[PDB]
Ligand binder design. Structure first.
Ligand SMILES: O=P(O)(O)O[C@H]1[C@H](OP(=O)(O)O)[C@@H](OP(=O)(O)O)[C@H](OP(=O)(O)O)[C@@H](OP(=O)(O)O)[C@H]1OP(=O)(O)O
Ligand SMILES: CC(C)(C)OC(=O)NCCCCCC[C@H](C(=O)O)c1c[nH]c2ccccc12
Lengths: 567, 57
């Protein structure tokens, strides 16, 4: 074959498969780099713009992630890195046809946004997921210039709030909006501009609003957008009035294609039942910001038989979840957030009986994130016995080093059962009183695990050592405040090359061991992020504040700030 | 199926299922079940894999 291959290859879109075909023959390597539409870059520092731009020169879509995950826990101080500019500037003159840029935890600035705008004529998709460092001015520029923008998705970013003016720069000739997620903006956009905008966008399919858009106005935008597949409300409070409740209700039943609901800030129980015609076609629901008691959630959930995803505060409760269990036979992912964590005081009656219920009740539960204050190995044993198909399990017990509250034992057989019975468990996040014994379970059993997160657990480096030793599929390992150090870390030095990153903060990894590892391992960047001043100003054997290791073909980076050392 | 003559829909029919031959198979599984011969000195066939898995995956 030949130009046939071009056509055969267009059918292949997974990175794994693309990489696979690139390695099958020199000819394939070549046809492939030429006709590859998207690149996934999980770690911006693992390779460089020019290397990417020069393999893969016909790229239409680019995805990039910066800071490690524990940057959400405030464990990576400001300035660390993540600058996206070099990428924009590199692609800025190579990537003429560029359509999408999805960035996760990056630094992004107004001149980045300008440059994106000025250089990509066909530009369509911008998702900035937990980025920072731009302002509504940057948004202005994108609005004013990108004439084919289809998605402007700002999930979870710190924007500089200069002002809502930015939304009016979309010209009147602009119609192509497909997705707009401005939930993180505090700045109040102009309601006229916005409404006028929703109306001339016939393809608008997902609209997610900021708080500043009061519940009273919801109805009006919805009558303008009756094709919405997903909606995130704005403020969801008001004087209780039936003109108001009624306009809402009608507006909502107007959207026969809604599947996704969220927002619900300051929600007034009185005004939830409007959402009910919607309820029964509904796949995702997110009630995270709704601080609304159990019975209210339960009235809402009762009529969502089709529900596949639910994020909810913990205000739902055990009784809550016993309901969900009989109700949503199709639930796939459940996330219970905590309602007030810095109080040690059960303010709700959410225990482990919840999770246990859900898991007998929903044959398709495969993803869980759950904050309770108490737990037992009897629960985890049951949970694991009931959901062999579990693929993501994060548990997060609010008291740390809290043990099974009936036996006082720590939770090792607990999580042992999970790792032993969910042979696809691909992500696992731990807590409770835990000894090196759990890691032995993990390393013996967790063979597909890819991501593991650990805090206040383990006894000695033996723990970390069964993990790098045992876990074949490990990609991300991240750890804080455990008694883990030099030994496991150098004993398993080359595992680090089969892994995307290892992050360790407040552990006991000495500066001496960091140093050695950099030299044993030219190709890892081993980074000591420590804020007390140079590490060599302290004895080699003092634990660094944080060290973050990761493979790279780019070697060491150029934008370290002052409190980061490469080795 | 070749073609010459350009029956655009049917290209789509074969390609989509040849492509279906390939997805989720190693560069060997492909190269075997296909009889391409590996023309990579293992120095290049290893700089390439390190790029693939470290940077693009
Ligand atoms: O594939 P990764 O590079 O490991 O990215 C993962 C992955 O995101 P994607 O699978 O969508 O690419 C997780 O997805 P799941 O584990 O849930 O399947 C996502 O988890 P969320 O569901 O919370 O989005 C997680 O996000 P996070 O790490 O913030 O929890 C994120 O991890 P990265 O930070 O490494 O991207
Ligand atoms: C801590 C502050 C600054 C408030 O940051 C946040 O607001 N963070 C949002 C909390 C996200 C919840 C993620 C749970 C996180 C996880 O990986 O799912 C987790 C659960 N158990 C753990 C044990 C050790 C390490 C990590 C975990």
């Amino acid at each position: 074959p030949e130009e046939v291959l071009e056509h055969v290859f267009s059918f292949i879109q997974l990175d794994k498969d693309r990489n696979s075909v690139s390695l099958v023959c020199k000819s394939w390597y070549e046809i492939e780099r030429w006709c590859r539409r998207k690149v996934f870059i999980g770690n911006c520092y693992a390779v460089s713009p020019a290397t990417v731009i020069r393999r893969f020169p016909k790229v239409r879509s680019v995805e990039l992630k910066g800071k490690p995950h524990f940057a959400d826990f405030n464990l990576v101080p400001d300035g660390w890195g993540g600058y996206v500019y070099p990428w924009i500037e590199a692609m800025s003159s190579s990537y003429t046809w560029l359509e999408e840029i999805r960035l996760k935890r990056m630094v992004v600035t107004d001149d980045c946004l300008e440059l994106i705008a000025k250089s990509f004529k066909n530009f369509k998709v911008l998702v900035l997921s937990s980025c920072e460092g731009f302002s509504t001015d940057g948004l202005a520029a994108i609005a004013a210039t990108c004439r084919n923008l289809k998605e402007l998705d700002l999930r979870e970013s710190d924007v500089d709030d200069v002002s809502g003016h930015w939304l009016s720069h979309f010209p009147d000739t602009y119609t192509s909006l497909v997705s707009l997620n401005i939930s993180c903006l505090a700045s109040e956009v102009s309601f006229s501009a916005l409404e006028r905008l929703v109306t001339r966008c016939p393809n608008l399919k997902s609209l997610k609003l900021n708080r500043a858009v009061p519940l009273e106005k919801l109805a009006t935008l919805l009558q303008r957008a009756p094709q919405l597949e997903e909606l995130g409300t704005g403020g969801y409070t008001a004087e209780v009035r039936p003109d108001v409740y009624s306009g809402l209700s009608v507006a909502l039943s107007g959207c026969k294609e809604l599947r996704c609901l969220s927002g619900f800030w300051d929600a007034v129980p009185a005004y939830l039942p409007a959402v009910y015609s919607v309820c029964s076609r509904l796949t995702t629901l997110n009630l995270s910001y709704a601080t609304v008691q159990s019975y209210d959630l339960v009235k809402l959930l009762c009529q969502c038989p089709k529900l596949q995803r639910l994020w909810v505060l913990d205000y739902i409760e055990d009784a809550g979840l016993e309901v969900l269990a009989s109700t949503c036979k199709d639930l796939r992912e459940l996330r219970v957030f905590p309602s007030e964590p810095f109080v040690m005081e059960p303010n709700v009656a959410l225990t482990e009986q919840g999770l246990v219920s859900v898991s007998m009740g929903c044959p398709k539960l495969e993803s869980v994130l759950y904050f309770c204050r108490q737990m037992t190995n009897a629960a985890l044993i049951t949970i694991a016995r009931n959901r062999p198909n579990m693929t993501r399990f994060r548990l997060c017990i609010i008291e740390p080093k809290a043990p099974d509250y009936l036996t006082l034992e720590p939770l090792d057989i607990g999580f042992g059962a999970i790792v032993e019975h969910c042979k696809d468990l691909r992500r696992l996040s731990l807590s409770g009183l835990l000894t090196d014994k759990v890691f032995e379970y993990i390393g013996t059993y967790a063979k597909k695990m890819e991501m593991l997160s650990v805090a206040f657990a383990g006894d000695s480096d033996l723990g970390m050592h069964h993990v790098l030793s045992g876990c074949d599929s490990l990609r991300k390992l991240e750890i804080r405040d455990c008694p883990f150090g030099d030994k496991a870390l150098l004993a398993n030095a080359s595992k680090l090359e089969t892994m995307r990153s290892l992050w360790m903060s407040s552990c006991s990894v000495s500066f001496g061991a960091c140093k050695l590892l950099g030299q044993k391992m030219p190709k890892l960047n081993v980074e000591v992020i420590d804020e007390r001043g140079a590490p060599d100003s302290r004895p080699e054997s003092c634990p660094v504040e944080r060290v973050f290791i990761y493979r790279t073909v780019a070697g060491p980076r150029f934008d370290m700030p002052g409190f980061v050392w490469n080795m | 199926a070749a073609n010459y003559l350009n029956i655009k829909n049917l290209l789509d029919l074969t390609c989509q299922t040849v492509a279906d031959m390939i997805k989720g198979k190693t560069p060997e599984e492909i190269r075997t079940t296909f009889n391409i011969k590996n023309d990579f000195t293992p120095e290049e066939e290893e700089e390439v894999r390190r790029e693939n898995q470290w940077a693009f995956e």
